[PDB]
């Protein structure tokens, strides 16, 4: 299973992140609404993140994301690591996704997204098995 | 099915046929490495491919002491090659938890697909359980 999300709108974000010069300790809390091709809302997401350390091999700004994505037909939890340098230069990021209820029960896999507008939009994929 | 959007390969038995390492799995350390050559089996017990790869323990994560480790490998299935690489925590590796990193189809059926290589140790230096998930 692949759920494509061409339009993920961030409706509320609260954060002390400097997108131009992010740093360890900066945090964020977001609410998103998830849209398919037609423009039908297929779900929402509530989550947060914290920029946690500077990785020594490349100066990656390793950030930890947690979120609950509530779709029409079940909840998906997702959690893990991304480099904020990728987030902020519009590269794809990813981290594990676990089916919690509904049709997603027993499916696991991965939550992927790419920023298309700062503090406002992204495209996403959810890939499960 | 022609041109499936999502693909899942279950690998319930992955055998570590050869492994050359200097890892102390009781207490691993930065700078330690391993080379592995595996064989991959499906539910029915027929061989579906091999993997050839390596890893190295690169740093101590300051958040929690995770031993972040960089893996690369070329997974040669009967119907095509999949390259996978990226980061895992060796404390997860050695305590039998699932780890993963990105995968890219390089040839055959997988050309133009991307996703993840997932696996869990079943016997340290002996065997594992694996999943390939592509889109």
Cα dihedral B6, B92, A113, A46 sign: positive
Nearest Cα of chain A lies from the Cα of B16 at a distance, in angstroms, of 24
The β-bridge relationship of strands A93-99 and A74-83 is antiparallel
Quote the longest CA-to-CA distance of chain B.
48
Contacts of B1 (CB under 8 A, 6+ apart): none
Please state, in angstroms and as integers, the Cα–Cα distance from residue B133 to each residue in A28, A109, B79, B110, following that order: 30, 8, 15, 11
* Cα–Cα distance, B114 to A54 (Å, whole number): 27
Nearest CA in chain A to B98: A96
* Cα–Cα distance, A122 to A105 (Å, whole number): 26
CB contact under 8 A, B8 and A55: no
Q: For residue B8, how far is the Cα from the chain centroid?
A: 15
* Cα–Cα distance, A60 to B4 (Å, whole number): 34
Nearest Cα of chain B lies from the Cα of A12 at a distance, in angstroms, of 28
Nearest Cα of chain B lies from the Cα of A52 at a distance, in angstroms, of 7
* Cα–Cα distance, A82 to A51 (Å, whole number): 9
Residue B25: which of B88, B63, B67, B64 has the closest Cα? B67
Experimental method: X-ray
Domain boundary assignment for chain B: 1-135
Backbone angles phi, psi at B90, to 5 degrees: -65, -25
* Cα–Cα distance, B129 to B98 (Å, whole number): 9
**Do A74 and A105 form a contact (C-beta atoms < 8 A)?**
yes
Chain A residues within 8 A of B116 when measuring between CB atoms: 94, 109-110, 127
Contacts of B75 (CB under 8 A, 6+ apart): B40, B49, B50, B51, B81, B82, B83, B84, B103, B117, B132
DSSP chain B: --S-S-EEEEEEEEEEEEEEE---TTS--TT-EEEEEEEEE-TTS-EEEEEEEEEEEEEE-TTT--EEEEEEEEEEETTEEEEEEEEEEHHHHTTT--EEEEEEE-SGGGTT-EEEEEEEEEETTTEEEEEEEE-
* Cα–Cα distance, B54 to B121 (Å, whole number): 15
Nearest CA in chain B to A81: B87
**Do B12 and B135 form a contact (C-beta atoms < 8 A)?**
no
Nearest CA in chain A to B67: A55
Instruction: Assign 3-class secondary structure to chain A.
Output: CEEEEEEEEEEEEEECCCCCCCCCCCEEEEEEEEECCCCCEEEEEEEEEEEEEECCCCCCEEEEEEEEEEECCEEEEEEEEEEHHHHHCCCCEEEEEEECCHHHCCCEEEEEEEEEECCCEEEEEEEEC
Query: For residue B89, what are its two tokens?
Result: 């925590």
Residue A82: which of A35, A22, A39 has the closest Cα? A22
CA angle B73, A111, B4 (to 5 degrees): 70
Chain A residues within 8 A of B68 when measuring between CB atoms: 55
CB contact under 8 A, B135 and A2: yes
CB contact under 8 A, B58 and A53: no
Nearest Cα of chain A lies from the Cα of B20 at a distance, in angstroms, of 24
Nearest CA in chain A to B134: A127
* Cα–Cα distance, A120 to A100 (Å, whole number): 27
Contacts of A13 (CB under 8 A, 6+ apart): A28, A29, A30, A31, A119
**Using only C-alpha atoms, what is the Rg of chain A?**
14
**Do A43 and A71 form a contact (C-beta atoms < 8 A)?**
yes
């Amino acid at each position: 299973l692949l759920i494509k999300v061409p339009t993920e709108i961030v409706v509320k974000v609260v954060d002390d992140v400097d997108v131009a010069a992010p740093a360890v300790g900066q945090v964020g809390k977001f609410d998103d609404e998830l849209y398919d091709e037609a423009g039908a809302q297929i779900g929402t997401s509530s989550g947060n993140f914290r920029i946690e350390y500077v990785r020594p091999t490349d100066g990656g700004l390793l950030t930890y994301y947690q979120e609950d994505i509530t779709l029409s037909d079940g909840v998906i939890h997702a959690e893990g690591w991304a480099d904020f340098n990728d987030v902020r230069t519009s590269k794809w990021v990813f981290y594990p996704a676990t089916g919690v209820s509904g049709r997603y029960l027993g499916l696991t896999g991965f939550r992927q997204w790419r920023m298309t507008g700062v503090r406002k939009s992204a495209e996403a994929r959810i890939l499960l098995g």
